[PDB]
Amino acid sequence: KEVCYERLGCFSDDSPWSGITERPLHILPWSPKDVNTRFLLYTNENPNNFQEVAADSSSISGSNFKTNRKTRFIIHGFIDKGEENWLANVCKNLFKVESVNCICVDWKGGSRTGYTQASQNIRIVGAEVAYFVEFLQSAFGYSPSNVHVIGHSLGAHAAGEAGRRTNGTIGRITGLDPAEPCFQGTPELVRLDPSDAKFVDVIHTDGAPIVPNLGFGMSQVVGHLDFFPNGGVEMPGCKKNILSQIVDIDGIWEGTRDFAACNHLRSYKYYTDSIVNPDGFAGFPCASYNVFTANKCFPCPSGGCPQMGHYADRYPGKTNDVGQKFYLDTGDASNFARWRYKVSVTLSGKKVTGHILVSLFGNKGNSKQYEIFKGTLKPDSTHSNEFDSDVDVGDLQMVKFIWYNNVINPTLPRVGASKIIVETNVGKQFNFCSPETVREEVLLTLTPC
Amino acid sequence: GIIINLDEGELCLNSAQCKSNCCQHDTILSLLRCALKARENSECSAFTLYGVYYKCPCERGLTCEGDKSLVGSITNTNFGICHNV
Secondary structure, eight states: OOOEETTTEEOOOOTTTSSSTTSOSOOOOOOHHHHOOEEEEEESSSSSSOEEEOSSHHHHTTSSOOTTSOEEEEEOOSOOSSGGGHHHHHHHHHHHHOOOEEEEEEOHHHHSSOHHHHHHHHHHHHHHHHHHHHHHHHHHOOOGGGEEEEEETHHHHHHHHHHHHTTSOSSEEEEESOBOTTTTTSOTTTSOOGGGSSEEEEEOOSOSOHHHHOOOBOOSOOSSEEEEETTTTOOTTOOOOOOOSSOOHHHHHHTSSOOOOHHHHHHHHHHHHHHTOTTSSBOBOOSOHHHHHTTOSOSOOSSOOOBSSTTGGGOTTTTSSSOEEEEEOOOSSSSOOOEEEEEEEEEEEOOEEEEEEEEEEETTEEOOOEEEEEEEEOTTOEEEEEEEESSOOOSEEEEEEEEEOSSOOTTOOEEEEEEEEEEOSSOOEEEEEOSOOEETTOOEEEEEO | OOOOOBOTTOBOSSGGGBSSSOEEOSSTTSOOEEOOOBOTTSEEEOOOSSSOBSSOOBSTTEEEEEOOOSTTIIIIIOEEEEEEO
16 A cells, blocks of 8 residues: 655555565565664764664754764664674774764664565665754754765665665765665665765675575666675675575575575675775776786776775765776785785796796885796796785885796706886886896895886 | 695695695694795794694795794794795
């Protein structure tokens, strides 16, 4: 039918909301006291124990909420076992680098149900956030431009609603892996899309298809920037879920079935690491992760790479188009960051078969040995490779060259490297030269020329 | 049979098993798995006999100069830092 609620207004049942093929079943949104959006507030001044605020002055007024610093709300969606704390941890890192009103949005009550109910109840958490956002603005004159909504799985689409209702005056929505079922290819109204804020940037990570493959994340581009880490579908570190042409989404969602949620949880783990690593995730404009891995988009263009996650607001062309894809590789854990380097090597010495490896040394550290080529090491031939250094070395000072093969080498041959050029991802080229050659498994230091 | 080629992180039982023969486990009680070899200037373990290290041996052509000390030391813990030569 239609249904109206105190404060939030009325929630229709029409197509697109319901009826259309992706979301056929007519369900309407549980009511606001049933959804039960709580806003738990964390700030620099109360970092680790929240204080519950709400859209009225007798709540905001004594609290650490401050109108002279930004507010960014973290809306959950799928919460894995153990993962309850994740919304807080995003706050804890914001505090390591900024003064912020970090409001985590809770709506466990609306989310613990069938998926389709929750897809629907997303609408209430959407108007809830828009209500608080419009509130600070009338109550206190606080522009929406200071507001940032971060939402994961369904939450993404909650933030998408919130922004929609604030009529895209919200500074930024960040979708961290917008759930797919009931939203992909569904119209903009029903889902997160570039118009829900002044800037929307999304991190796809589990973009496989949900059926047959349990690809919980959307794959469709929905932001002005869509970063696809590790090619937006399998993440290093993450076990893959086994196939099924009949997937129980409600079962996945309540937790009756099994689910390697890893690929979907990774977008907020990347976002969290991003806060404290501000060059560590640079997204290269490729046109696919395959072109990208085939070393063809490198370095960043003229006016940067965008940082995936937290720092993407700083990329100067972020709203020049919608749906701009960017690729990058991350770690498989811990500090997720990575810095990519292209190094070319020109061979000097004998023709041999072997592996050439290079290793960089710079003002702030040194990489390990990354293989550049395998097979016939022909003198005066060049070879190139792009690799993901788990270490930013700083500006390079020297490089080292080394080769080997698994055959006893009778001649005791000697290969070395005439010049070795390192191109940073920003694109600075550093040159290194040597007249020496060296024996198998000896480290030939090159130095600037 | 013999097991060969296990990747970074796979559980292992001696270093031969690992593509970068270093089957590591910090702590005596831990479940030993293939680790990467040490970079230049990080900590290392000297080359052992027991095929499972606490700290990996160094990557190619670095020496891990620490203290290959007496028995005791060498019957378990000799560490060092990979240095070039």
